[PDB]
From a paper:
PB1 domains are protein interaction modules with critical roles in the assembly of protein complexes involved in autophagy, signaling, cell division, and redox processes, as well as the auxin-response pathway in plants. PB1 domains form homotypic interactions via conserved electrostatic motifs molded by basic or acidic surface patches on opposite faces of their ubiquitin-like β-grasp fold. While type A and type B PB1 domains can form heterodimeric protein complexes, type AB members can mediate interactions with either PB1 domain type or engage in homotypic interactions to form homo-oligomers or hetero-oligomers. Our cryo-EM structures of filamentous p62 and AtNBR1–PB1 assemblies revealed that the presence of a tandem arginine sequence in the basic motif of type AB interfaces is required to stabilize a polymeric assembly.
Of the three PB1 assemblies studied, AtNBR11–94 (AtNBR1–PB1) and p621–122 (p62-PB1) formed homogeneous filaments of constant diameter that appeared best suited for high-resolution structure investigation by cryo-EM. Image classification of segmented PB1 helices revealed that both AtNBR1–PB1 and p62-PB1 polymerize in two different tubular morphologies: a projection class with a ladder-like pattern, we term L-type, and a projection class with a serpent-like one, we term S-type. Further analysis revealed that the occurrence of L-type or S-type assemblies is persistent along the individual helices in micrographs of AtNBR1–PB1, whereas for p62-PB1 filaments regularly displayed transitions from L-type to S-type symmetry. Using the derived symmetries, we determined the 3.5/3.9- (L-type, p62/AtNBR1) and 4.0/4.4 Å- (S-type, p62/AtNBR1) resolution structures. All four structures form tubules of ~120 Å and 150-Å width with an inner diameter of 45 Å and 70 Å for AtNBR1–PB1 and p62-PB1, respectively. The main interactions are formed between a double arginine finger formed by two neighboring arginine residues in strand β2 (R19–R20AtNBR1/R21–22p62) stabilizing strong salt bridges to acidic residues (D60/D62/D64/D73AtNBR1 or D69/D71/D73/E82p62) in the OPCA motif located in the β2–β3 loop and the α2 helix. These interactions are assisted by the canonical-type B lysine (K11AtNBR1 and K7p62) in strand β1. In addition to the canonical transverse interactions, the helices are further stabilized by longitudinal interactions Y14AtNBR1/N28AtNBR1 or K102p62/D92p62 and R59p62/D93p62 to subunits of neighboring strands along the helical axis.
Numbering used by the authors:
A (entry chain B), B (entry chain A): 5 to 92
The structure:
Amino acid sequence: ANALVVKVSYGGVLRRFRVPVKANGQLDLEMAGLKEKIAALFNLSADAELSLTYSDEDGDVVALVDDNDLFDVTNQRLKFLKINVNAG
Amino acid sequence: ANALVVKVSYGGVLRRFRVPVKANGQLDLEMAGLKEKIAALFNLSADAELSLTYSDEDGDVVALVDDNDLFDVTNQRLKFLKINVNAG
């Protein structure tokens, strides 16, 4: 009955919020619902371009592009996800 | 007159349901009755390919392909069966 901890950080300020999962198994938001969620935390202009990059299990710097790779984060089995913002 | 606990897990969310046996000794469903049963739990597109892999007694990742290997799960004498989905 549990959520995934997501920690983001832009301009050297770490934040954290939680994302519920369905009974089904997929994460209960999408990129369109995520990009506007990050713009809430940082008082960012939402029209700006967002370059979101997580960390893999085995430490690469992967890119986030679609709701298909948001599916992969569940199967990746990571303890908490960490997402870097690059704007402008 | 008793059932086998099967636990499935796709997108990192565990589920569980039970499967009865006959008086005779075989499991009381088959793959076509199983594959469409898993698609009920996960709201999966049933037209997608399913690659179902159980765990052996001695811990291998065996493949499930047919109703001949579903027979073997009874004789395998496992405490509860665990079935991983790989789609796409």
